Design a protein around this ligand. Structure first.
Ligand code: FMN
Ligand code: NA
Length: 362
């Protein structure tokens, strides 16, 4: 029953702890990377969630690495998001925008001027991203070799997160979630496998965490620390980005730095979903010891797991991913122990209403 009780999340009080994890769906309008009324209906259908966390959204045009992913850096984008947030709030829902810079998980055809994408170091991501073929359908393509950011360019990255959070506030969102996970730009700097820099942003864990903490500080001053959430994936390997040979201690360092800044929540994307070893309770307790604020757990969660960890005080809420794709009233289904619709993975990425707004309620 506690999974269905209210929770204060920074400045915002949500009615339950069944959260919608951020899910890239690649249905935005190109050119311009504009959210659509169809996306608004998708999110409106899921506003019984205690907190919707949007698909990852570009902080700038440079941030783009997927065709079809939305932006929050242009007046067109802001206007369209404003209708989405209004739609969710008119269902008495709550909504946070996940903000990313994709870094080296990108393609030069998606970048301003067709230039190479940026990263902490000029090292191939060794993975693929999603473009659109001439008929508008998602296709997987090798990422482009990135250019290493100059030291003097790091403030511009911070400044672009800062402005994007300003726009998130103007656009009506309740919170923002910094995307510091899954091998995108912030995680690239955190990871010794993607970051081989020789300036103050590479090497030691203090140098590697510096950018993400500069971002947290800037966006907290732009809006408020109690409006800032962050998603991390600091244990295991994700999209070919690992967390180095001291991953547990390094993770606990970052978590303690985040706690010092009073942020609204810590959202941990666990490896049990991808194919790694799941968090031990001893690790979870070390996290909790360092982070007394809201912790969101994610990745292959049962209701059993959710109750267990919530009743134990180790997490405060759970973000459901694929089950939210297929079940707009997931909250009701979980309370009533009803069954779930089956997922149609062939329509997760790209397309239109089918596999998106056409999953039914009880
Ligand atoms: C289609 C799809 C899109 C996703 N998009 C994002 C994203 O934009 N940002 C992010 O942080 N995680 C993203 N994820 C990871 C999920 O948010 C989630 O954490 C993961 O799938 C495991 O949780 P689950 O077992 O409930 O699906 C995505 C996953 C899927 C399947
Ligand atoms: Na040089």
């Amino acid at each position: 029953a506690k999974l269905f009780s209210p929770l204060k999340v920074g400045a915002v009080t949500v009615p339950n702890r069944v959260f919608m994890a951020p899910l890239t769906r690649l249905r935005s309008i190109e050119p311009g990377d504009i959210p659509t009324p169809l996306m608004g209906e998708y999110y409106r259908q899921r506003a019984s969630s205690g907190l919707i966390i949007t698909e990852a959204t570009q902080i700038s045009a440079q941030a783009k690495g997927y065709a079809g992913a939305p932006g929050l850096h242009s007046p067109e984008q802001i206007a369209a998001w404003q209708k989405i947030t209004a739609g969710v709030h008119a269902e008495n829902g709550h909504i946070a925008v996940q903000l990313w810079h994709t870094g080296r998980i990108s393609h030069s055809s998606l970048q301003p001027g067709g230039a190479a994408p940026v990263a902490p170091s000029a090292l191939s991501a060794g993975t693929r991203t999603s473009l659109r073929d001439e008929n508008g359908h998602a296709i997987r393509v090798d990422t482009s070799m990135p250019r290493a950011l100059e030291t003097a360019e790091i403030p511009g990255i911070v400044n672009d997160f800062r402005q994007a959070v300003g726009n998130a506030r103007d656009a009506g969102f309740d919170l923002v979630e910094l995307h510091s996970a899954h091998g995108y730009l912030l995680h690239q700097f955190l990871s010794p496998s993607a970051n081989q820099r020789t300036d103050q942003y590479g090497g030691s864990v203090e140098n590697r965490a510096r950018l993400v903490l500069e971002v947290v500080d800037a966006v907290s001053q732009e809006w408020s620390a109690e409006r800032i959430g962050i998603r991390v994936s600091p244990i295991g390997s994700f999209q070919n980005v690992d967390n180095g040979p001291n991953e547990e201690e390094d993770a606990l360092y970052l978590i303690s730095e985040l706690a010092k800044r009073g942020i609204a929540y810590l959202h941990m994307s666990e490896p049990d979903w991808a194919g790694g070893k799941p968090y031990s309770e001893a690790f979870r307790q070390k996290v909790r010891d360092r982070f007394p604020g809201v912790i969101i757990g994610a990745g292959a969660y049962t209701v059993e797991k959710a109750n267990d960890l919530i009743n134990k005080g180790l997490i405060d809420a759970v973000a459901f991913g694929r089950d939210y794709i297929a079940n707009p009233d997931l909250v009701a289904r979980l309370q009533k122990k009803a069954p779930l619709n089956p997922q149609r993975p062939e329509s997760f990425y790209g397309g239109g209403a089918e596999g998106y707004t056409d999953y039914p309620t009880l």
